[PDB]
From a paper:
Denitrification is the stepwise reduction of nitrogen oxides to dinitrogen and is utilized by many bacteria to replace the terminal oxygen-dependent steps of the respiratory chain under anaerobic conditions. The reduction of nitrite to nitric oxide is a highly regulated step, since both of these molecules are toxic to the cell. In [name], these domains form homodimers by interaction of the 15th β-strand of each subunit, which is consistent with the SEC data collected during purification (data not shown). 1 [name] [name] adopts an open and a closed conformation, and it has been hypothesized that these states are linked to the catalytic cycle.
Residue numbers in the entry:
A (entry chain A), B (entry chain A): 21 to 543
The structure:
């Protein structure tokens, strides 16, 4: 047969199915399963037909400097395949494929069997103080030694590399990409080495390890945007064990939703459970892995379009926000119930938040507001500060909007606030630091990008991350003009510049994950 | 001879000079005379050699959707010329050319001699209520009828079309592009028609007409980034009459600066003079055109890196800011002196500002702050409010940072504030409106982008512009996803939606210039 779309170059039924398979294996992680866009732009026929075949071939062939791979000049895709892809994205988007146990098992690779792995750490690295750094546009992670401020390893994962997580033993580093590829890295090998890989879906954002006491390295979980599902895997091998669909009913209208994406997963410390946020249906699932054949799930209704979330300081209450809402949902992971919906007056910015002790209000959890740069504080201690629990107690004011990350550490007296997307260049190039011992005082500004010494041009600073001791804070810096990058390290006790990590291998550093602080949910 | 650069494909001395001529005629308006970038990205060899010949050819050939023309697929440039350009931008940037009276006169075209033009308005348009709208990526302006809300004419100018200005008679519309091309349009023709064109430099931003009483249509002035100069032309024909270099000594170090760009030009109402801001040397020039053969210029030292500025409500004091400064310079255009340097505590955002009467402080001029969305008010009435003159008297707070334009009108009780570059989508898609009769009250938010009804996707709203009566406010809206655009019209007395202008010819509408309000400096 012939596939035809108004205004599109007709294709063979075989050409279309070949392009379909390429699209969902290689493109959908960034462009979406219905091509509506995510990290990458929309590729629906209204837009692509306006660009035309030859423009589309050119873009796919050479890529762009802002994260679109050069599929042709890389050799990843053939001239003929690129022509097929340029034709394909001008046709109506088809139904995306499913991805079950057969597809997962076919993608599963064990490079080093558990019995062939070392019995102890064979390298001499200070593993808890390693930083795993995403090299966004290079499809790699870099392992950076926190003590010597040197790159010690670079590891290929794939385009669309996203985040790193740690197993509860501290031995295994887990990386997931937006195409739902997972890599498992053994930090005890003579040089840290990939030991297993698997693909759990077409599009994904989240991975996590089992962190309840006694379950170290037992299970790894991953959540997909498409298909709407999460998968529980063997923590030692990534062998897929259980797959659970998240298709289902919405919390607000109780009508069936055909694509409830998994937004985020964190690991419970109160029970052997994973906390799974399901976005469109607005459900927080507590998934119990004490028995994975007789699988227990508690579904807590929260609010539609759930985003990220994070633990409070006690690791009991899960603080989460939904888009289009001024409320923070508080899930009690111990009693397995919704505890509160906290009005913070403004829309909270998705993220783990930042926990610290307010001298007056006691333990608080904090969230930023993207538009105006304010930060809301919520009391999180029903035991000793019941008069403040699940209430907004205060508001701090940063330099302005555009913050992506706020960060503290239990051993630090400072709160760091970036302003990556602020439209003023001096503010996007700097970070605000609040004194937790005098929260009535204005923040101080650290000139992070200037310290990086990267030449003239637009520089953006992102994501404060502490070292294992809590006495250094690391920042990613990148000059959009010349492709140049650095990690800037501040002494948290003095607020002085301590080090600048520069290396040609440090390509578009974005997320930085300190091993200890990621393993132990320290924020 | 052979031109060679480390890492660049060698070129014929003739090929290089051919590419040089193309670069400075067609590319430098956006990419800069030393290729350091302006509207378009930097094209210095460090960056271009990393991209490589074939990527560079592809980009030049097909362009990009964010304002880089498709030189090859347009037919503007040959395959051979595009190869030469891709080689050329990998070589060391050469010295840019000069552009004097011979070059200006060679570019000068009179399409309709003044004696052949109509003696009165032959079309039936309400000319004072026309809006001249920049169609940024189309190289055109659209004339939109303020009464019927319909496009009535579309006029080609060139890529990099920038702003519109009006002659003091109300008859001639002046358009300048970033390549320093000027078009003069006769609004009295049966259909408004280009009557003259000229090129006054390689790179430019500003054009203005003579507005002192009695000099209607006598002179047009334009200022260039490169060469560092301004040119005075005959107001009826654009014939070049006088060219003045702005090369000279800096205000702060009194050392010679070889490229002092003309930042902005406005027209004096106190004297037959143009006010010319010279950026790097920090000089405000009062250029007197009573006698242009015996040319008098008063040079007022202000501050380095002068930007835009605007008149106060009385059209006597020129309010201007320099980058990297918390001060607003006040130039008295009547007495021809610096009046004050007003500390507003934060960096003012370049712009004309907004004038209104504060019930307590009297006439004030207002400026926004890009980072945090605040607005500073300065008293501008030494006669009746001397206790507030040249002092910051108050601060308003908008939705957040990212404002590009604030706007009022003497017949309006509202102040409008866009937030085009705010990182929160709801804020960038809306505008704040303050009640000038109750400035203690919080602003109201108008959902401008939602009213435009442009489908899902990132939409940005920019530049409130009033109609001639002051009772409508117009906004440009554009959906980045689908290329779709609208002008949204609000009833200023009710703050209700009044009209939505949609037309496939409305491609990337940016600046909107109401004829009457531009002619009479009404802001
Ligand atoms: C994330 C790592 C991506 C993957 C994998 C793919 N694409 Fe992509 N693409 C991505 C981005 C961030 C962008 C925008 C970059 C820009 O500079 O703004 C793009 C762009 C495209 C386009 C152009 C869209 C347009 O001009 O409107 C096309 C045609 C495109 N991408 C296609 C495409 C294909 C077919 C891919 C699989 C082979 C693919 N992309 C992968 C990000 C990412
Ligand atoms: C303004 C109207 C422009 C004119 C005239 C020219 N260019 Fe341009 N260019 C412009 C922009 C806004 C951009 C960036 C667009 C993007 O999508 O972000 C560009 C880009 C380029 C590039 C690519 C740079 C890179 O990938 O780093 C090149 C090689 C380039 N432009 C070359 C070029 C030439 C040779 C031109 C004259 C023939 C030219 N541009 C004109 C804006 C504008």
């Amino acid at each position: 047969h012939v596939v035809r779309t108004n205004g599109a170059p007709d294709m063979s039924e075989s050409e279309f199915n070949e392009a379909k398979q390429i699209y969902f294996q290689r493109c959908a992680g960034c462009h979406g399963v219905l091509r509506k866009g995510a990290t990458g732009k929309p590729l629906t026929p209204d837009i692509t037909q306006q660009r035309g075949q030859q423009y589309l071939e050119a873009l796919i062939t050479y890529g762009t400097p802002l994260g679109m791979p050069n599929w042709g000049s890389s050799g990843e895709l053939s001239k003929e395949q690129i022509t097929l892809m340029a034709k394909y994205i001008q046709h109506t988007p088809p139904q995306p494929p499913e991805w079950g146990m057969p597809e997962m098992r076919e993608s599963w690779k064990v490079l080093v069997k558990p019995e062939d792995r070392p019995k102890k750490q064979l390298n001499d690295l200070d593993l808890p103080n390693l930083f795993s750094v995403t090299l966004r546009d290079a499809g790699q992670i870099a392992l950076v030694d926190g003590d010597s401020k040197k790159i010690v390893k670079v590891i290929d994962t794939g385009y669309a590399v996203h985040i790193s997580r740690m197993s509860a033993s501290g031995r295994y580093l887990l990386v997931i990409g937006r195409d739902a590829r997972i890599d498992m890295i053994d930090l005890w090998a003579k040089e840290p080495t990939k030991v297993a890989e698997i693909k759990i879906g077409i599009e994904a954002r989240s991975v996590e390890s089992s962190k309840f006491k006694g379950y170290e390295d037992r299970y790894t979980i991953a959540g997909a945007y498409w298909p709407p599902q999460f998968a529980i895997m063997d923590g030692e091998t990534l062998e897929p064990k259980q797959i659970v669909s998240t298709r289902g009913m919405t919390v607000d209208t109780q009508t069936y939703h055909p694509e409830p994406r998994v937004a985020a997963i964190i690991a419970s410390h109160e029970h052997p459970e994973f906390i799974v946020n399901v976005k469109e249906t607005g459900k927080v699932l507590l998934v119990n892995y004490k028995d994975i054949d007789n699988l227990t799930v508690t579904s807590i209704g929260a609010a539609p379009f759930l985003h990220d979330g994070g633990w409070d300081s006690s690791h009991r209450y899960f603080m989460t926000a939904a888009n289009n809402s001024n409320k923070v949902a508080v899930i009690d992971s111990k009693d397995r119930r919704l505890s509160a919906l906290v009005d913070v007056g403004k829309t909270p910015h998705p993220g783990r938040g930042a926990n610290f002790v307010h001298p007056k209000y006691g333990p608080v959890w904090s969230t930023s507001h993207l538009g105006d740069g304010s930060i809301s504080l919520i009391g999180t201690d029903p035991k000793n500060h019941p008069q403040y629990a699940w209430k907004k107690v205060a508001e701090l004011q940063g330099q302005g909007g555009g913050s992506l990350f706020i960060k503290t550490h239990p051993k630090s007296s400072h709160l760091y606030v970036d302003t990556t997307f602020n439209p003023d260049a001096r503010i996007s190039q700097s970070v605000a630091v609040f004194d937790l011992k005098n929260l009535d005082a204005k923040y101080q500004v650290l000139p992070i990008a200037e310290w990086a010494d990267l030449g003239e041009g637009a520089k953006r600073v992102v994501q404060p991350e502490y070292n294992k001791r809590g006495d250094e804070v690391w920042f990613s810096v990148w000059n959009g003009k010349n492709d140049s990058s650095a990690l800037v390290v501040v002494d948290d006790k003095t607020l002085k510049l301590k080090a600048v990590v520069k290396d040609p291998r440090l390509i578009t550093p974005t997320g930085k994950f300190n091993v200890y602080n990621t393993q132990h949910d320290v924020y």
